[PDB]
């Protein structure tokens with residue numbers, strides 16, 4: 001099931017993300033709308049492209065904690081987090097709290113207090 005480092009198998013991971021990536025809102029990158037994104041920020045439970053993933057990787061884990069859904073190891077709780085999150089829930093939250101000019105391309109959401117607040121909404125879902 002789960003290895004000594006606390007990671008699910010590559011196969012369980014594969015079966016999980018193949019489904020969750022196919023959810024319609026998850027089929028375009030959260031930041032730039034590039035199609036079929038396979039990278040992710042665990043923090044906001046959003047899927048992002050290989051291009052936007054590099055930008056996120058320069059920000060630092062407290063801002064955005066980046067993994068490849070294709071390649072990286074995941075713990076079981078990180079899968080649940082991706083499952084209850086997704087691009088649709090995040091877009092919905094941010095368009096409300098950041099408004100009509102919500103512009104995920106700049107990743108302003110990631111460093112924002114609103115970003116922190118959404119990250120905590122997700123923490124609360126997976127913890128209580």
Ligand SMILES: [Zn+2]
Nearest residue numbers: 029032049052
């Ligand atoms: Zn992108």
